[PDB]
Amino acid sequence: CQDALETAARAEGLSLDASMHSQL
Amino acid sequence: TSKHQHPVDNAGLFSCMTFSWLSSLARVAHGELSMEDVWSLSKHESSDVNCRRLERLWQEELNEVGPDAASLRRVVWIFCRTRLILSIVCLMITQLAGFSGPAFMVKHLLEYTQATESNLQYSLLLVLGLLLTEIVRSWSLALTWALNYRTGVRLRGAILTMAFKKILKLKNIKEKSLGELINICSNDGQRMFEAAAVGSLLAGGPVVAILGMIYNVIILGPTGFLGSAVFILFYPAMMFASRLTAYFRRKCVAATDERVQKMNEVLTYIKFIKMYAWVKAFSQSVQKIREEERRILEKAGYFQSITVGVAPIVVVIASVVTFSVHMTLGFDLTAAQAFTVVTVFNSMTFALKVTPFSVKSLSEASVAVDRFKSLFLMEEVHMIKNKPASPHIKIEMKNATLAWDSRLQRTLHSIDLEIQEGKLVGICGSVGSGKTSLISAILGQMTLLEGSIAISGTFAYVAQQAWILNATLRDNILFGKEYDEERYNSVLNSCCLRPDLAILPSSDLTEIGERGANLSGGQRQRISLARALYSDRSIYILDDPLSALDAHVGNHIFNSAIRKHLKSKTVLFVTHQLQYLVDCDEVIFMKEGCITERGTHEELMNLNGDYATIFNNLLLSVPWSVYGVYIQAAGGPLAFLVIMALFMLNVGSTAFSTWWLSYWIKQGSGNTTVTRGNETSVSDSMKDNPHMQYYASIYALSMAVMLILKAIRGVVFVKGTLRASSRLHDELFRRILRSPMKFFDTTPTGRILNRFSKDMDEVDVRLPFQAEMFIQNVILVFFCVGMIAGVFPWFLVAVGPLVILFSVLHIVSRVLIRELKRLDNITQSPFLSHITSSIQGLATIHAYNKGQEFLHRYQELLDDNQAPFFLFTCAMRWLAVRLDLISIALITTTGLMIVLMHGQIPPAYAGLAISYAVQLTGLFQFTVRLASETEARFTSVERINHYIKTLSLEAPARIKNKAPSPDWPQEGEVTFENAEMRYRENLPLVLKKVSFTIKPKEKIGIVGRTGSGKSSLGMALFRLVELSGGCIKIDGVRISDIGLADLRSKLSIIPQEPVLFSGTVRSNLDPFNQYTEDQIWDALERTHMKECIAQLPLKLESEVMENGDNFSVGERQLLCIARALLRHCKILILDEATAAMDTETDLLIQETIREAFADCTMLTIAHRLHTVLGSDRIMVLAQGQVVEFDTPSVLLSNDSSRFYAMFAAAENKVAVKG
């Protein structure tokens, strides 16, 4: 989900935020 | 958004490759950027064209094999075929250049270094070719990234537009979850964009990895497969470690949810906890939950820190194994081959670090396509379009048989309905008779089996729930219609909206939420009428418009509007109140979907049918202070120094292993004479060194020491960060739990609850990871710079200018990048609000046929949200390109310095420098990326620390006056002497000069108006808030000389609302476990609760959830008094223990209270004058003053008494209903 094998590759111009969409 | 043509469409290959337009925009910005400065979405990226193309492709694919085996993956591939093919070709070129350049150039440079003759021209060609290849590959990667971003943006826009268009024509609106529908049109687009981007980036690993494997096999020989075997044995282990970390985080999520629920339960009833002195038990439970979460986080960090930094470790381990095996067998090894293999291993590590996110993106894309295909197969709604025989008839159905859809559920059979223009027709029936079925059928939500239905014109629909639009009073009422003064005034006056306008100071421009936060049911119903009136459709449909409305205002609105304005238009009325059909034109009764009696009102009354029966039935940037605070909380400077020392030790061990390899290569034969034929001479061969085993053992020991140090450093860092988190948790819990409740009164518990939840989850999930990654990257960069500068002392003269250039680039980039992110979320809130509002009112929009304006607004919002995101991605790519160019210049400078000094240094040192220079690619970008996300958590740390030093301190637990007496209170005598009470500063006084005496064994009933101060007696008796004047004496001892712990241990208060903490029944009675079983059983049987408890198999171990919603209300209240009995307090106060409960239950509760505490004083704070009769004395409060103090027997005998007047008023209110 957020291991080093994933966030390091997306650090080339991709936002570090998946959804942050849950509401009330 | 203000532009003529998008600069992307007017940019050449070089301009788009280097992103010159965004560089100019950033230079223009460099203190803030607004939406008027950014450019709008390009024409080629417009949502309309992409949505139309996607819809055409989907329609073409549907009519190929049928709507049963069509996959959206094929449609996406067809849509993006050209762009993805171009991206694949560009990435092939990039990988080919990145494999051909560094390895071949390093081999050629190191081969020339070993040559005796020196050439000043051949090396220049090599370095020029290396620089050209690096520039070409970087530019191709930039172009690939730009094309992928454009393709992803287009695909996201098209798919979101198609999803919104499909949802607007959904038949079964309630079939899908409310959250799922919003998530489909909100989160899925970003998932598709990222998935497409990293899937285009996917084809970079398997090609270059195989190329490097082949090159290593060709160069080294049969021993080149060792690195491949190491990679195959290592990377799946990292994947398994990641899976285990995810599995542990799965339980961590549940643990955090449980902790959050416990914190919410604690904060919800904080007043009760303070008044009951049960802080210790809840604190212990919270501590146990926190320690369980700490253990889970320790396991997660232990299973997570392994894969944080593994590429250099994997490279070094593979090099160690390969070189040791190759050299021990007696073969020959040279510096050039070894360093080429090292660089190729670095390339494989980069590729296999990029690949896992590509695999995850592919999985996410598959999930997204499956979810989208699940929704796209839903049934669509249909509209009635046929015309009647004559314009006179508006509604005409002949024996129509219609059924529900979910399969067909028949509800209407042989329907013969004919309604003319200008005739008011009402529908009568019971629940399930088919009144709602007719409303659903006339809209067009039912299928036709037999007969035909004639519909002319549109309909005006009013929702029972009164759905509202996220706008003001003016916007939603017009509903897109033209604004006129007289019509609006008449509509407002007809529905009696004047009180609503008077209540709201800015009712004309008052914003309303999605469902309505400052509106009532009647106001919502009235607004519905107003909107429908403005709509002014030919046919009016009323689905219970006066249900929640009061009778008087509903009848007034009916007479003023329906009987006057709608006299010449068709009106359909459906309601449960049949008294409004007396003046209606036609009456229709619905019963089981079959028409039995219909006609006029008098005919229906004369027929004496079921209608008559029911009628007569109803008639009756953060500063360094945050960093210092975090360092201090981590364990002081010692922990920081230890962590830094361990990190430097690991990095230095890796560097020392590499340097020892270089030293071993440089050593050679060590001036040893060997025989190679007829003559003996010194030969430069590493296989002739007699210290083979010594070097091999040192190399293996260095590798093992590096691994052990890395593991120890990871474990120590995880332990330190978790200890800091635990220290922060305990400190924050202690600060809040001891602060006065005035903070709770001023700031709602929701704010602190959200702060706790979000901040703690975010920090415990991200901060150790980001900190470890940033520290590792920074130390690796520093070591790489130092080692190159160590061999060449002149390397700093080029580093310096490059350092200041990098700092300048970071300064400029830190403003634009952080500004575009804010603008991206600025328009996201209107986007989410519009998405939520449309789904909550889909039926109303479908009835009003307003599916085009909403779609256009959605498209506009999608474009206005996609443009800043595209600009931000382009800026990120530009920054990455600049950092890559800086690294390329560094590598070129290193190579140029290497070339000039050939023949003066051993080739091993030059190879080491050129190998460490290659690894510098990507490290600068990683360091820059992690320097912005770490700060995002330090602001949360600062927010947490804000409440740490802001909360005040309450009264001390132990008062220096000591305990008054071991048996205090000696009796139950209380006295008041000029009691002064105020809630807060500058607030009006609640109690002013009130003094009274209460004799032992007396029943006192306090009754008064709201705000008199009746509820303030309990607050002042418990010393909840320090008194502003006067003194209170209890048994001859002043209350203020007794500590809070001792004062509350001998007084009892019954809460107004039954409270049941989650956990166990025993834990809800005495968590500290001070009482024995027999006393608890006697207390339970005193309130007749023994039978209801012993019946369960877990009488003392029964599970109680939140609010205790598993017993009856009376059982909960009885348990409440049973709990209040355990403390054995001589003073008891009752405050409104009855609220909407049956009669005999309250009688039993009253008799149980009377019999249980006959020996305890009573202070009854009740508003019902009937329940206070029979007490010893009656207390009356008049705005904080006492006027009457005597027995109720003489109070009711005086007509001038205020208590008698209140009792008479209550009796009149009870008697008159009316």
DSSP B867-900: HHHHHHHHHHHHHHHHHHHHHHHHHHHHHHHHHH
Smallest Cβ distance to B360: which of A6, A19, A23? A6
Q: How far apart are CA B435 and CA B427, in angstroms?
A: 7
**Number of Cβ within a 10 Å radius of residue B404:** 16
CB contact under 8 A, B198 and A13: no
- Closest-approach residue (CA) in chain B for A7: B357
B480 labeled binding residue: no
CA-based radius of gyration for chain B = 41
CB contact under 8 A, A5 and B245: no
Q: Choose from B141, B357, B835 for mutation: most chain A CBs within 10 A.
A: B357
CB contact under 8 A, A11 and B930: yes
- Closest-approach residue (CA) in chain A for B821: A15
The C-alpha of A13 sits at a distance from chain B's nearest C-alpha, in angstroms, of: 5
What's the sign of the alpha-carbon dihedral B649, B650, B656, B659? negative
Residue B86, helix vs strand vs coil: helix
Q: Where are the beta strands (DSSP E) in B602-700?
A: 673-675, 680-682
Residue B444 is classified by DSSP as: T
Taking one residue from A and the other from B, the number of pairs with CB-CB distance under 8 angstroms is 77
Can B393-619 and B974-1215 be said to share one CATH topology?
Answer: yes
- Closest-approach residue (CA) in chain A for B355: A9
- Chain A residues touching chain B at CB-CB below 8 Å: 1-16, 18-19, 21, 23
Please tell me the total number of residues recorded for chain A in this structure.
Answer: 24
Contacts of B876 in chain A (CB under 8 A): 12-14
B169 labeled binding residue: no
B434 labeled binding residue: yes
DSSP β-ladder status, B673-675 and B680-682: antiparallel
Q: How far apart are CA B26 and CA B359, in angstroms?
A: 34
**Percentages helix, strand, coil for chain B, rounded to the nearest 5?**
60, 10, 30
Residue B905 is classified by DSSP as: S
Q: Which amino acid, B701?
A: L
DSSP β-ladder status, B991-994 and B974-981: antiparallel
CB contact under 8 A, B880 and A23: no
Smallest Cβ distance to A9: which of B310, B354, B876? B354
Smallest Cβ distance to B245: which of A3, A14, A18? A3
CB contact under 8 A, B353 and A9: yes
Smallest Cβ distance to B357: which of A10, A15, A19? A10
| CATH fourth-level superfamily of B393-619 | P-loop containing nucleotide triphosphate hydrolases (3.40.50.300)
Q: Choose from B245, B929, B932 for mutation: most chain A CBs within 10 A.
A: B929
Contacts of B197 in chain A (CB under 8 A): 14
The domain locations on chain B are 393-619, 974-1215
The two tokens of residue B363 are 């999985």
Backbone angles phi, psi at B339, to 5 degrees: -75, -30
CB contact under 8 A, A21 and B304: no
Alpha helix ranges (H) inside B269-376: 270-276, 279-304, 311-328, 335-376
Alpha helix ranges (H) inside B1132-1201: 1143-1156, 1192-1195
Tokens 């256009």 sit on residue: B856
Residue B406, exposed/middle/buried by CB under 10 A (0-12, 13-18, 19+)? exposed
Question: Cα angle at B410 between B406 and B414, to 5 degrees?
Answer: 145
Backbone angles phi, psi at B1068, to 5 degrees: -85, -5
CB contact under 8 A, A16 and B877: no
The C-alpha of B242 sits at a distance from chain A's nearest C-alpha, in angstroms, of: 6
To what resolution in angstroms was this structure determined? 3.5
CB contact under 8 A, A4 and B246: no
The answer to whether the CB of B1004 falls within 8 A of the CB of B1197 is: no
| Domain range B974-1215, CATH class | alpha beta
CB contact under 8 A, A9 and B194: no
Nearest to B545 by CA among B572, B518, B563: B572
The C-alpha of B944 sits at a distance from chain A's nearest C-alpha, in angstroms, of: 20
The C-alpha of B295 sits at a distance from chain A's nearest C-alpha, in angstroms, of: 19
**Number of Cβ within a 10 Å radius of residue B488:** 16
The answer to whether the CB of B110 falls within 8 A of the CB of B914 is: yes
Nearest to B554 by CA among B582, B529, B590, B517: B529
Contacts of A15 in chain B (CB under 8 A): 821, 872
Q: Which amino acid, B663?
A: Y
Q: How far apart are CA B666 and CA B612, in angstroms?
A: 112
**Number of Cβ within a 10 Å radius of residue B5:** 10
Nearest to B941 by CA among B717, B642, B633: B633
The answer to whether the CB of B529 falls within 8 A of the CB of B558 is: no
The C-alpha of B1055 sits at a distance from chain A's nearest C-alpha, in angstroms, of: 30
Residue B453, helix vs strand vs coil: strand
Q: How far apart are CA B860 and CA B160, in angstroms?
A: 12
- Closest-approach residue (CA) in chain A for B824: A15
Residue B635 is classified by DSSP as: T
B1011 labeled binding residue: yes
Q: How far apart are CA B68 and CA B373, in angstroms?
A: 11
CA-based radius of gyration for chain A = 11
CB contact under 8 A, A21 and B186: yes
The two tokens of residue B961 are 């006056």
Nearest to B1029 by CA among B1065, B993, B995: B993
DSSP β-ladder status, B393-405 and B447-455: antiparallel
- For residue B541, give Cα distances in angstroms to B76, B241, B443, B1114: 43, 62, 10, 45
* Through-space distance between the first and last CA atoms of chain B, rounded to whole angstroms: 64
Question: Cα angle at B180 between B178 and B186, to 5 degrees?
Answer: 110
Q: How far apart are CA B561 and CA B460, in angstroms?
A: 15
Contacts of A20 in chain B (CB under 8 A): none
- Closest-approach residue (CA) in chain A for B936: A16
Q: How far apart are CA B717 and CA B840, in angstroms?
A: 48
Residue B988, helix vs strand vs coil: coil
The C-alpha of A11 sits at a distance from chain B's nearest C-alpha, in angstroms, of: 6
B435 labeled binding residue: yes
The two tokens of residue B924 are 């600068």
**Percentages helix, strand, coil for chain A, rounded to the nearest 5?**
30, 0, 70
Q: Which amino acid, B1189?
A: F
Contacts of A7 in chain B (CB under 8 A): 357, 769
Alpha helix ranges (H) inside B739-795: 742-746, 749-791
